[PDB]
Amino acid sequence: HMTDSEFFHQRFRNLIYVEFVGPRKTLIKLRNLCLDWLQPETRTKEEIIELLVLEQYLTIIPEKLKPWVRAKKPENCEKLVTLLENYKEM
């Protein structure tokens, strides 16, 4: 159903290793966070791969374009590519 999956993406990426918690509990947490981000029960392996490609692409955007790309929120790669095909001379 509708969720803030990006909240979980950020938590997954920003979780820190806390010695008091230790390795097994840290694995459990990471797994829960990644599943609440990617919701594999709703998506195919192919769709998941596309999300990972999008995640990486968003990080490598030239810095001068990042505010623009994010104001726009392209929700998939194709979008992002057609957008950068028309946003660049900045």
Residue numbers in the entry: 1 to 90
Paper text:
Human paternally expressed gene 3 protein (PEG3) is a large multi-functional protein of nearly 1600 amino acids with a mass of about 165 kDa. Consistent with the presence of a large number of zinc fingers, PEG3 has been shown to bind DNA in a sequence specific manner, and has been detected predominantly in the nucleus, supporting the notion it is a bone fide transcription factor. PEG3 contains a SCAN domain near the N-terminus. The domain functions as a protein-protein interaction motif, mediating self-interaction and binding other proteins.
Here, we report the structure of the isolated SCAN homodimer from the human PEG3 protein (PEG3-SCAN). Crystals of human PEG3-SCAN belong to space group P65, with a VM value of 2.44 Å3 Da−1 and solvent content of approximately 50% for an asymmetric unit comprising two polypeptide chains. The crystals diffract to a resolution of 1.95 Å and the majority of the residues are located within well-defined electron density, apart from a few residues at the C-terminus. The human PEG3-SCAN domain folds as an extended V-shaped structure, with approximate overall dimensions of 50×25×25 Å. Helices α1 and α2 which form an N-terminal sub-domain are aligned antiparallel to create one half of the V. A C-terminal sub-domain, which forms the other half, results from α3, α4 and α5 being packed together. The domain aligns with the N-terminal sub-domains interacting with partner C-terminal sub-domains to form a dimer with approximate dimensions of 50×37×30 Å. The free energy of dissociation (ΔGdiss) is estimated as 19.4 kcal mol−1, and suggests that this assembly is thermodynamically stable, consistent with the observation of a stable dimer in solution. The human PEG3-SCAN homodimer is held together by an extensive network of hydrogen-bonding, salt-bridge interactions and van der Waals forces. The majority of these intermolecular contacts are formed between α1 and α2 (the N-terminal sub-domain) of one subunit and α3 on the C-terminal sub-domain of the partner. A hydrophobic patch comprising Phe49, Trp74, Leu75, Ile85, Ile86 and Leu89, from α2 and α3, make van der Waals interactions to equivalent residues in the partner subunit.
